[model samples]
Target chain A: QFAKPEDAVKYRQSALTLMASHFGRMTPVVKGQAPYDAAQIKANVEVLKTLSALPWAAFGPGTEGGDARPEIWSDAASFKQKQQAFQDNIVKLSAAADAGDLDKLRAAFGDVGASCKACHIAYRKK
Target chain B: QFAKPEDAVKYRQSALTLMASHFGRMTPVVKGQAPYDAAQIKANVEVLKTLSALPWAAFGPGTEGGDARPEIWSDAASFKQKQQAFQDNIVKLSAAADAGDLDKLRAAFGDVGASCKACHIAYRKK
Candidate 1:
């Protein structure tokens, strides 16, 4: 995790930008107006790849003045497992996105949501 | 994050158990049948506290992870802000739960759901 707060902010903004960009690109495909573009699909894959490398500690636990729960820091191993599963599926989704395969996308997307619910059930306060 | 995959599973399971326990206690309070018990309230509060301290990164990108978005890791600061807001509301809820104050709990619970929405809008894929 970056020690500076500003760095954290910048990181998040970049992520939001990527997410918005991806969502924008995906809207057409989702609406069946146009097929998913290979380049756009690759771009999203790259974004997720970049995202996987960063130190996620800044967002959790006692690090750098935040509301991240202590359980995140204490129970680190399990957290990573969930992260890995999510990323693996992202890779699969990226491949389907490249091919404009709707069926694959749907199944992969469902997998992604399941992974999210699994993590949230554990980590989130609500 | 811990290197072992099993640790991540255990942490997540623990979190789920705690949440279920808290939710179980809250159901009766929500139904207005039984007053909140101080001990049960405290237990729920403790669970939230534990959640607040955990390493959320494990749930995010490149770890043993789940469907946690790369955006969460990339935009750590905003994520923490959301997390903090959630916890603060949880504290308020804990107090309400302890006192069996339905009105206060309703207000606080609303805030918590809103926070969840905000995070979901930014970080979630769907």
Candidate 2:
């Protein structure tokens, strides 16, 4: 699940790029300024889905990444649960976005954010 | 300025819907399944950018929302910092998405997620 440091760096670099692009593209839809784009939205969701499944174990003890806190590995179950929650929420969100229903989208987003908050509370150091 | 509970609920509902829609739309971009849509990306980014600026004080202490933790209002400075970080990241992400470049999008997404994690760590109560 863990790549070598160099490999991790490369993978992370690519991962980050994709993430940023997705968020940027999402701006119009969320603001109700335009019609939703299903293909683009689906692409970003998949990236997060994969990220949630990554072997977070690689960062083991001390790590340089800003958010790579110790508890991620130490508190494995909770961490996994949180990650899984994120994945699930994204999937639901994807469906809502595809449907272009504002009401459903809002509920799903809150749920997804909650999943993120849940793990950060217990695992993140800062 | 605090909105009444009813107003808060309406805003939250609308906000959540937009948020979920954006995430869903982002899936394809991150997965590399399709070319990025600059217009669509911009729409979603705007929603988050606005959300980050929300006062959040209206939620106050105890509330129905899942992630409205006590510390957000109590430790105001830290909470504001986290919120600001999230907003900054969203702006950056929006720019990348507009460019339709995968590399840039990936980086921005991670930063946005980090902001999300940062806020959750201090403010969310498990």
Interface Cα RMSD in Å, per prediction: 15.1, 13.8
Which residue runs of candidate 1 sit more than 4 Å off their true CA positions?
A1-126, B4-17, B33-35, B55-61, B98-100
DockQ metric, candidate 1 = 0.02
Q: Over the stretch B5-112, how does candidate 2's per-residue lDDT look in tens digits?
A: 544434433343334334445767767786667776675566445444433533554434544666766777877777667777788888887787678887888777
- Which candidate leads in TM-score? 2
| lDDT per residue as tens, model 1, B26-46 | 556655677756576565555
lDDT of 2 by residue, A1-126 (tens): 233454343333333333333334455666668775666556555544543343343344444354456666667777677766777787897787667666777677678767757766876657
lDDT per model vs. reference = 0.55, 0.58
Cα lDDT tens digits, model 1, A2-116, are 3466545344333333333333445456556776566755655554444433335335443433333346556788877777777787677777767767777667666765775
B105: Cα error in model 1, Å: 2.4
In terms of docking quality, model 1 is incorrect
Residue B81 shift from truth in candidate 1, angstroms: 1.3
Q: Provide the DockQ value for model 2.
A: 0.02
